[PDB]
């Protein structure tokens, strides 16, 4: 069996090849206690990684080692991987090959250090790096379409006509779930609620995951919320207070289709899909239109599939038909696709052997993997 580790900006999923679900799913945060230890009865470890830090997030400064799909702090990333293999998966990496995932259009040094760490710290027999969006299409049982992935750091549209992705038509935007969380707490102060610290940031993410939804018609829905009631929902904070949010339910997800609210000149998630398709061949455009696939946790809002279909239809010519595919398990689509790829018999020749890395150093990751 081959371990399939899908490191993500917000959460990382690890498991085994051939399984239908990740074995361990924990947040990718490393926290350190800012206060001074006063008691000596307990261990009081230097740092906490994963769900251990989430439980004690009150007294820790949570820091994300990955930002926009780029590993900013390699000292904390080694802590997370050491926690995945020895505490969650409880397996020895020295016996099983490891499959990793990297976002497209990333710095070459990001995946070069990944190879160096795997082959020098954990001594894995083999390794491989695959595009996150490409694996999302395999989980849906397709080999021809456009994948609209969206997580915490990256929202990339990768049109995949065949088993290999099209490199020249890949569009990547730095607007994802984490950006919306910072916008949600900015407009939450309008109602009198102030969430500033990183510990309070995790509270906002819970509100976004449960109450936020995408409105079919933003202009019409804003007028409806102006009449008060029938739209305000109550959420209970860990302290105990009950907060009510009105038009903020659909305003935060609306930043996806209108990035001008965040002060970014980039186009919305609906136009960036149409722009990506326009960069492909005329013959292939028919297949990509009818095989659009969503993935990632950001696209799990109630009604995003319905809203996306309407926006693309207006931009696309009326002759073409638009069919947005939203699988029920699109949150774990990246990992599930990787499980299928690892279990394939043909993939056994694509592994990077330990001897191969030694002869060429870390630079072999660019030439072999894609």
């Amino acid at each position: 069996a081959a371990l399939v580790v899908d490191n993500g900006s917000g959460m990382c999923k690890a498991g085994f090849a051939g399984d239908d679900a990740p074995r361990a799913v924990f947040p990718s945060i490393v926290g350190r206690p800012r206060h001074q230890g006063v008691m000596v009865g307990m261990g009081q470890k230097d740092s906490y990684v994963g769900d251990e830090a989430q439980s004690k997030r009150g007294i820790l400064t949570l820091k994300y080692p990955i930002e926009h799909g780029i590993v900013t702090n390699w000292d904390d990333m080694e802590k997370i991987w050491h926690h995945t293999f020895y505490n969650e998966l409880r397996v020895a990496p020295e016996e099983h090959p490891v499959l990793l995932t990297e976002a497209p259009l990333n710095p070459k040094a990001n995946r070069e250090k990944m190879t160096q760490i795997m082959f020098e710290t954990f001594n894995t027999p083999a390794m491989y790096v695959a595009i996150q969006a490409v694996l999302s299409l395999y989980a849906s049982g397709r080999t021809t379409g456009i994948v609209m992935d969206s997580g915490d750091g990256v929202t990339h549209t990768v049109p995949i006509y065949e088993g290999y992705a099209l490199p020249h038509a890949i569009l990547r935007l730095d607007l994802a779930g984490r950006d919306l969380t910072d916008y949600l707490m900015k407009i939450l102060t309008e109602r009198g609620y102030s969430f500033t610290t990183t510990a309070e940031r995790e509270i906002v993410r819970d509100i976004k995951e449960k109450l936020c939804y995408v409105a079919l018609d933003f202009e019409q829905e804003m007028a409806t919320a102006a009449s008060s009631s029938s739209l305000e929902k109550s959420y209970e904070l860990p302290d105990g207070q009950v907060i009510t949010i009105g038009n903020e339910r659909f305003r935060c997800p609306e930043a996806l289709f209108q990035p001008s609210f965040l002060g970014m000149e980039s186009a919305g998630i609906h136009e960036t899909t149409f722009n990506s398709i326009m960069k492909c061949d005329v013959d292939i455009r028919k297949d990509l239109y009818a095989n659009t696939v969503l993935s990632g946790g950001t696209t799990m809002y109630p009604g995003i599939a319905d809203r996306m279909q309407k926006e693309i239809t207006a931009l696309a010519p009326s002759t073409m038909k638009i069919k947005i595919i939203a699988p029920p398990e699109r949150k774990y689509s990246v990992w599930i696709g990787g499980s299928i790829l690892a279990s394939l018999s043909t993939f056994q020749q694509m592994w990077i052997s330990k001897q191969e890395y030694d002869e060429s150093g870390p630079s072999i990751v660019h030439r072999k993997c894609f």
Partner: peptide, 7 residues
Amino acid sequence: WXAXCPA
């Protein structure tokens, strides 16, 4: 404030 801080 209402939720968060004292104001």
